[PDB]
Amino acid sequence: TYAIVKTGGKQYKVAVGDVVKVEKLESEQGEKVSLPVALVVDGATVTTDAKALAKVAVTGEVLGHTKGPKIRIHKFKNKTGYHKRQGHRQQLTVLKVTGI
Amino acid sequence: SQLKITQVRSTIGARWKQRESLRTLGLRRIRHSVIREDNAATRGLIAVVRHLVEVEPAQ
């Protein structure tokens, strides 16, 4: 069995026991989250219906909060003297799927 | 009545009376909508800028 869960404006194909990095949720480590689904597959049944899928939730457990890789930006246009240095670390959440 | 004006195209390359008429209607970017009244000063603004907006008689 697996579900397609919707979180952070993006979708993820998850099963019970999977570890997923998602966007930063405002929940602390050890708590529980309820997340909406877009499709649920249980073998040969696909359930595919907004009246039915709005009653099915995925239960997640927060493992903690990690960071993205370091991204380095050095903008440069050709013969201008224009330079701009910038860095970024995206903030993530690690999430064990327990529900479906 | 009361009109709904949605901006469809860009102000890049538009002229001064076309950009300032979109500024007085309250539009900011593409697909931004606004609700305004159907008085004579409003559809004179719409007549200037009707190639850049899509009007519908909505609530």
Binding site: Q11, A38, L39, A44, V46, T48, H74, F76 | -
Partner: protein, 124 residues
């Protein structure tokens, strides 16, 4: 106070030359040529982080289109069918079901084919 330059100046020289390891020729060896190439490498990287969002979508659509034609429908009317049936699964996962579970992808085509109108060429 006469100040020697080398303790300050070698700081950015060591970091440019470490970012250029694995370049060939003068581009991993010489600081002036390693730095011209780091300007291009971080512009190319910026340019390609915004391009691969379209590149992976171009990969997924190609695989949804291949799997739909096995199930005698085009990509064209499949996307119309899933919007008509209210299936909000994105193309990242629709090209992932098409590989790992081909039976569930056949079950999604039948939902898309049923919600499609009776004559698709008739006006709305």
């Amino acid at each position: 106070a006469r100040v020697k330059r080398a303790v300050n100046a070698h700081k950015k020289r060591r970091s440019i030359l470490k970012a250029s390891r694995g370049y060939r020729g003068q581009r991993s060896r010489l600081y002036r040529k390693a730095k011209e190439q780091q300007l291009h490498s971080l512009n190319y990287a910026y340019r390609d982080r915004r391009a691969r969002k379209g590149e992976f979508r171009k990969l997924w659509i190609a695989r949804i289109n291949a799997a739909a034609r096995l199930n005698d429908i085009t990509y064209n009317r499949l996307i119309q069918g899933l919007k008509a049936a209210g299936v909000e699964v994105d193309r990242k996962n629709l090209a992932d079901i098409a590989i790992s579970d081909p039976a569930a992808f056949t079950a999604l085509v039948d939902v898309a084919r049923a919600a499609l109108p009776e004559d698709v060429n008739a006006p709305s």
